[PDB]
Amino acid sequence: KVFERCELARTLKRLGMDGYRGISLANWMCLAKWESGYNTRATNYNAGDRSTDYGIFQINSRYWCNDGKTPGAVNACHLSCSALLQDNIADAVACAKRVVRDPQAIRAWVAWRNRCQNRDVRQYVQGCGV
């Protein structure tokens, strides 16, 4: 599913993401926007290390979910990577929360550092009623 901007903002809010571990909803929107264009079925293979990024937040198979084909990978969110390709983002949100409970928090995603950090992200939630 490809979410429309405000549709996703309210969906994330309902899921408890607004201010989760100090991360504003606007930051999560900026992350999903740059990672997948709000697309839950997006996938990106990384030929260099044999891992794959899954779903709306492009969560990597090396450390977060199990796809059974990534060498010596672990599964910190304890989910099948398939769970990250659902139209319903509840599991992807639970996993994204798991990711930010680590030392780097939101900085775990390089795309967030490149396109969201120290930037005006207000735009992402404007007019969405969140």
Residue 50: both structure tokens together: 């044999």
The CA angle 8-11-17, to the nearest 5 degrees, is 100
Please indicate the experimental technique that yielded this structure.
X-ray
Resolution to one decimal, Å: 1.8
| Residue numbers of the domain that contains 21 | 1-130
d(CA 121, CA 81): 29
In this structure, what DSSP letter does residue 112 have? H
CATH number, domain of 3, equals 1.10.530.10
Let me know if 126 is exposed, middle or buried by CB neighbors in 10 A (0-12, 13-18, 19+).
exposed
The residues annotated as belonging to the active site are 35, 53
CB contact at 8 A, 46 and 52: yes
SS3 104: coil
Q: How many structural domains is the chain composed of? A: 1
